[PDB]
């Protein structure tokens, strides 16, 4: 789909971040509020049957 630039802070320090396994997009989609900055219009999916 077509779409509906951040400085270095104290918060996004990569020296504080442990890079062990690469985080993908389906992690952001399955859990929309844990890994997302500005999660505006997401919808909560079904968990499990």
């Amino acid at each position: 789909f077509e779409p509906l630039d951040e400085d270095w802070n104290e918060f996004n320090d990569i020296n504080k971040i442990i890079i062990r396994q690469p985080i993908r997009t389906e992690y952001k989609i399955a859990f929309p509020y844990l890994y997302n900055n500005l999660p505006h219009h997401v919808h909560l999916t079904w968990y499990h049957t």
């Binding site: 789909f1 630039d5 951040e6 400085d7 270095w8 802070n9 104290e10």
Partner: protein, 1261 residues
């Protein structure tokens, strides 16, 4: 296809909304109650035929309703004209797109119906039927032309294409391989039914209605109706011709800022007039701001809109200036007494610390008055050397300047008398230079005052350079271009004592800022009090009372009482000395005394006495360009902590809010730009606050929102600054990766003076403001009219490209967005010419049209891009007495490779000036004067150039001090834009070389003989090129089109469409009126038929003589039809020969081919045909043309020839070629070779053709 179908499904799921409640809808129930409709039961195929024939009858009635007898509708709904149309018949054939949409829908419907009619006749099985309905809904777009009529229908095709894909492969596993047939037409059927659901009511509405500044004007009309309708009839008959006269006068007086007042007017109608003026004023102000904000973002508009909007905002800025001057005259002086006394005594202490001697008045004869007056007159005639046609008020100015030349001592007496006496001056006019981003004023001064001010400017700068008034940190200087200033600033950053050692918590601070409203906040009384310390009091009163004069714009007059007049000559002094007073306020007297050093031994720019006084203070680098300051600090740990404590004492930050609002460079990546650690942000806030505390806000003001702070620490890897249009990032070698040493452009390698090892790297980029200014210049070039020639546009483009590249030499290669913008603007400039040639867009167009130099008839375009010369465009040809010889000779070279970089030029300049110093020292001791023999090895090498040493005006140009800031301030005096504001050719020399570009351009385009094949030169009958000349900078558009006609009118340029001219055989590809107007003038009065009949009569006179040598008994000139000379489908014989007894004939061979073996088929009749050709660049080979026309005309049942043995002679007039192909009898071939040579050398009709070509091209020798 899966992903796009899922995209459409997600869009239909997201855009779904519940339908609105309504009454239940029944069209057929209302149709049933009407007695005009009946109901029955029919088969599907019969009603499917009835619907399509009723639709055919409806479209036939709609065609013959407008009496269109020339349009035929096929039974498959194909609409075709029966003949070639005319102008009015194309006007009367303009239907809506709904007509052709209904046409294609009924075509689709008839295909769907007849597919089943093909089935129920027993022709195909249902297994073959279900495939046929599957092909239709999948390939609507290939079987119908309905896709050209609705563009949104492109959504409906590809969806039906994507459903075409899936099912196929889901069908094609197992024993099924490939081949036609699935038979699952429902998926394509539903989509077109849903399409018809939306297309139905629009077509119904079309058939229904077929078969059956202004807003302000309306507002003014409503206001006038509200005024006039209230008054009764005896007042209606009076105020209709009473109000409208002063109604425009009140608006004009508002526009001229005149207070509107008239006696005898009642108060409610006066309030109504005030409300009218206020509403129209709000509308006009919003319209002006809206039209400025439209054209700021690059939206195209007519030039008259810009010309009106410039005047609108000129009037609004004049009303704002008259408001702020009245606010100063009402509010009094904004400066307090204590601040004025403080800066006054500060200037006193600085002039006492330097022991400055004031500049006196020139008493009677300074013995340099003549040189300064001549330099002032040359600067005044510097602007008027551009054009040779001037206005009358400028002719008076040049007359006064020439009278100042003829009698210089009287001019000096008038200048000195106006200095000692005159204090009142004439009014200064104001205009605005129309930059698209930033409005800038240009002032107009009386010339008699202007000569005096220019001599004052020269005298003041010449005295200020001698008395050492300005410290070397005040920039720009006469000896340094601003990129050399950037390089010396980087070397000054590098050469500090341990500037990169941050093991103990040291910090680097790079501040850059601009003095906000420097020119508008100078009090004239304070200026006079600070000016009386350095010059004579009469000179100071002259400089002060000049600024108190009335500024005029065409209706508006206002006196000046606050702020200096920047358009004056001597005002460039007023900018530079007063900013030195700012040096006393920001830097402090102790640190400025340490930087300037003793008056008996002054220090150099960015140099000091020792290392102790250099590093004894944190304020250790300082520079100021005209309004922008650039300061560099070195901090330890404890000083930085105490400064942050002093900042947070008065301005605490409990929530760390100083991070938001920090200015940071967005052109660099995040690992490249400044990392916003909290200590560094607090240190930058503390630095800017400590600098801001030293300046009184009534004197000058700096702002955080226009400033920038870069902090280097343990947590920041790199330093940043913007200066002189350059973005600069400094990065250490020791804080980065290993030795690798990859050579890149835009990278300055920084080394130490002492150890001479590499310590840091400087990275250069072009800032955003220069690219936006360049795009503004591109848009100003794109505002050329249609009557403007192409060469003027190309010259403006070349001027802008040189003015970009020769300033930004090394930094263009580093940035990639500017490299993309150059190519994009180059394609826009080329497209501007391609549209000006023909309205239809060509498929291809050669670059050799553009990049041919002006000497060869081209445009002389510069190149910044990757342009390739394709093969079969570098082949050329020549004809001589043995036949036709062909020859074969790649990328266009660019500009950036033909310009030296900055760093190598600086190293070369230092080396050649050191060698010149040593050779001068050896020349003085040996009693030797330096000549061209000792300086021919370093020619055109160095900044400034060595060429300035051998000029005739050494004693004249040696007295011109302070020329660079005057050259920069020329933009406030002359209305034209000023490229190369940073240089002057008489002082610094020429800094580039552009003859190698023209040499490699001629070499790379296949040579002169390779270029001249495109140029119609061989039709002009000049044997050489070097003896020719053009009739006289610019070429007209018709001459350019007629010159480049062999390479424009080609088959591969305008593909498909071709026509033929009536009286000639000239084929035009597309249509070009600017070439047709030349082809009619050259080929007028049946010149094609005259040339053809002249060649026929000349060849008949050749065959008339020498009769017995060829055994000819009768020569016959055939009755040539007058349309034969240009008809090219078929031809006929022109000259017939009767053999006396018998002749032998050979096989058909070329005119230059001598391998002739004759056969036994003896014939008596022989025929000769003459064919003329007008060729182009890809098709002008006359030999294969003659062979193809002979094999065409002798092998068809359409051409008529009395004999099977003959020859076809083909002549190309566009290149003056001639050849022959066919049968030959003995003795005929050398005779016809010499005869055609004599014809091509001496035909008077060809001479008339060639002299008309030379008259049209205006090319002589």
């Amino acid at each position: 296809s899966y992903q796009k179908l899922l995209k459409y499904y997600v869009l239909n799921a997201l855009k779904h909304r519940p339908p609105k409640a309504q009454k239940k809808r029944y069209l057929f129930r209302s149709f049933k109650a009407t007695k005009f409709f009946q109901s029955t039961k029919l088969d599907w195929v019969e009603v499917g035929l009835q619907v399509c024939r009723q639709g055919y009858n409806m479209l036939n009635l709609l065609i013959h309703r407008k009496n269109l007898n020339y349009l035929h509708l096929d039974y498959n709904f194909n609409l075709k004209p029966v003949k070639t149309l005319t102008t009015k018949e194309r006007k009367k054939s303009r239907f809506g797109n709904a007509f052709h949409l209904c046409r294609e829908v009924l075509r689709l419907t008839k295909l769907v119906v007849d597919s089943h009619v093909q089935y129920r006749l027993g022709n195909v099985d249902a297994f073959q039927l279900a495939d046929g309905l599957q092909y239709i809904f999948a390939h609507v777009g290939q079987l119908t032309g309905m896709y050209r009529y609705k563009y949104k229908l492109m959504r409906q095709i590809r969806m039906c294409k994507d459903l075409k894909h899936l099912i196929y492969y889901r069908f094609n596993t197992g024993p099924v391989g490939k081949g036609p047939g699935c038979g699952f037409w429902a998926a394509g059927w539903r989509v077109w039914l849903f399409f018809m659901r939306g297309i139905t009511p629009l077509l119904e509405r079309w058939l229904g209605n077929l078969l059956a500044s202004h807003f302000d004007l309306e507002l003014r009309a409503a206001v006038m109706h509200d005024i006039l309708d209230m008054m009764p009839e005896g007042i209606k008959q009076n105020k209709a011709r009473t109000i409208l006269q002063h109604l425009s006068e009140a608006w004009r007086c508002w526009k001229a800022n005149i207070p509107w007042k008239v006696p005898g007017l009642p108060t409610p109608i006066e309030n109504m007039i005030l409300r009218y003026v206020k509403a129209k004023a709000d509308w006009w102000t919003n319209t002006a701001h809206y039209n400025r904000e439209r054209i700021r973002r690059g939206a195209t508009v007519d030039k008259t809109v810009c010309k009106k909007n410039l005047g609108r905002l000129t009037r609004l800025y004049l009303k704002a200036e008259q408001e702020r001057q009245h606010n100063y005259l009402k509010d009094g002086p904004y400066i307090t007494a204590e601040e004025a006394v403080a800066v006054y005594t500060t200037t006193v202490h600085w002039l006492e610390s330097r022991r400055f001697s004031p500049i006196p008045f020139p008493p009677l004869s300074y013995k340099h008055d003549t040189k300064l007056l001549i330099l002032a007159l040359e600067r005044l005639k510097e602007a008027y050397s551009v054009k040779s046609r001037l206005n009358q008020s400028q002719r008076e100015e040049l007359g006064l300047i020439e009278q100042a030349y003829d009698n210089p001592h009287e001019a000096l007496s008038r200048i000195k008398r106006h200095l000692l006496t005159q204090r009142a001056f004439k009014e200064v006019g104001i205009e605005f230079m129309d930059l698209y981003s930033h409005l800038v004023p240009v002032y107009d001064v009386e010339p008699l005052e202007k000569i005096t001010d220019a001599y004052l400017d020269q005298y003041l700068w010449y005295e200020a350079d001698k008395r050492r008034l300005f410290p070397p940190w005040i920039k720009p200087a006469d000896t340094e271009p601003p990129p050399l200033l950037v390089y010396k600033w980087c070397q000054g950053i590098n050469n500090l004592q341990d500037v990169w050692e941050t093991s103990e918590g040291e910090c680097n601070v790079m501040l850059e800022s601009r003095f906000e409203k420097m020119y508008e906040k100078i009090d004239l009384t304070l200026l006079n009090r600070l000016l009386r310390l350095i010059v004579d009091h009469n000179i100071a009163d002259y400089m002060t009372a000049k600024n108190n004069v009335v500024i005029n714009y065409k209706d508006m007059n206002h006196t000046n009482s606050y702020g200096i007049i920047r358009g004056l000559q001597f005002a460039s002094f007023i900018v530079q000395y007063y900013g030195l007073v700012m040096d006393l306020l920001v830097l402090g007297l102790h640190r400025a005394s340490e930087m300037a050093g003793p008056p008996q031994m002054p220090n150099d720019f960015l140099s000091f006495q020792d290392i102790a006084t250099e590093a004894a203070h944190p304020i250790r680098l300082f520079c100021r360009y005209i309004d922008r300051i650039h300061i560099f600090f070195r901090f330890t740990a404890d000083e930085a902590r105490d400064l942050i404590q002093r900042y947070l004492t008065e301005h605490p930050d409990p929530n760390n809010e100083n991070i938001v609002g920090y200015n940071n460079k967005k052109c660099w990546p995040r690992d490249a730009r400044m990392r916003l650690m909290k200590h560094d942000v607090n240190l930058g806030r503390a630095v800017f606050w400590d600098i801001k505390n030293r300046l009184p806000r009534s004197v000058t003001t700096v702002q955080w929102e226009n400033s920038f702070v870069s902090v280097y620490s343990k947590d920041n890897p790199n330093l940043l600054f913007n200066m002189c249009g350059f973005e600069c990032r400094i990065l250490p070698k020791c804080r980065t990766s290993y030795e690798e040493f990859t050579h890149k452009d835009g990278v300055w390698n920084l080394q130490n003076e002492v150890t001479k090892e590499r310590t840091a790297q400087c990275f250069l980029r072009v800032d955003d403001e220069s690219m936006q200014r360049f795009h503004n210049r591109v848009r100003q070039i794109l505002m050329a009219s249609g009557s403007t020639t192409f060469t003027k546009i190309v010259n403006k483009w070349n001027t802008a490209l040189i003015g970009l590249m020769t300033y930004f030499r090394e930094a263009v290669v580093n940035t990639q967005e500017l490299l993309d913008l150059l190519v994009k603007c180059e394609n826009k400039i080329q497209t501007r010419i391609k549209i000006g040639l023909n309205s239809k867009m060509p498929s291809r167009f050669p670059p050799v049209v553009f990049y041919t130099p002006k000497e060869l008839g081209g445009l002389g375009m510069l190149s910044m891009g990757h342009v390739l010369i394709p093969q079969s465009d570098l082949r050329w040809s020549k004809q001589t007495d043995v036949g036709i010889t062909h020859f074969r000779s790649q990328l266009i070279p660019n500009l950036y490779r033909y310009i030296q970089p900055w760093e190598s030029e600086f190293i070369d300049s230092q080396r050649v000036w050191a060698e010149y110093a040593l050779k001068r020292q050896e020349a003085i001791a040996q009693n030797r004067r330096l000549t061209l023999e000792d300086l021919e090895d370093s020619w055109d090498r160095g900044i400034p150039r060595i060429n300035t040493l051998f000029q005739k005006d050494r004693h004249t140009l040696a007295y011109d001090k302070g020329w660079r800031v005057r050259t920069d301030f020329k933009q406030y005096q002359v209305l034209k834009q000023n490229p190369f504001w940073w240089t002057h050719q008489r002082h610094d020399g020429k800094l580039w070389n552009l003859n190698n570009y023209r040499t490699d351009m001629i070499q790379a385009l296949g040579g002169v003989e390779g270029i001249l094949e495109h140029t119609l030169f061989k039709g002009t009958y000049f044997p050489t090129w070097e003896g020719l000349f053009w009739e006289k900078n610019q070429i007209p558009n018709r001459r350019f089109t007629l010159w480049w006609s062999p390479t424009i009118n080609r088959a591969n340029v305008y593909v498909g469409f071709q026509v033929q001219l009536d009286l000639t055989g000239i084929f035009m590809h597309g249509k070009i009126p600017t070439l047709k107007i030349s082809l009619i003038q050259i080929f007028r009065a049946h010149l094609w038929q005259k040339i053809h009949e002249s060649i026929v009569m000349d060849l008949c006179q050749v065959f008339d003589q020498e009769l017995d040598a060829l055994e000819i008994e009768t020569v016959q000139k055939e009755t040539i039809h007058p349309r034969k000379s240009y008809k090219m489908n078929s031809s006929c014989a022109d000259i017939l020969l009767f053999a006396s007894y018998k002749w032998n004939v050979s096989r058909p061979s070329l005119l230059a081919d001598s391998k002739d073996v004759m056969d036994s088929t003896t014939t008596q009749k022989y025929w000769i045909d003459i064919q003329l050709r007008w060729g182009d660049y890809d098709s002008h080979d006359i030999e294969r043309y003659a062979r193809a026309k002979f094999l065409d005309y002798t092998t068809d049942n359409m051409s008529i020839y009395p004999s099977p043995t003959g020859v076809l002679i083909a002549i190309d007039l566009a290149y003056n070629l001639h050849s022959a192909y066919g049968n030959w009898f003995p003795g005929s071939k050398p005779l016809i070779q010499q005869a055609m040579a004599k014809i091509m050398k001496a035909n008077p009709a060809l001479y008339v053709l060639r002299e008309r070509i030379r008259k049209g091209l205006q090319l002589y020798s």
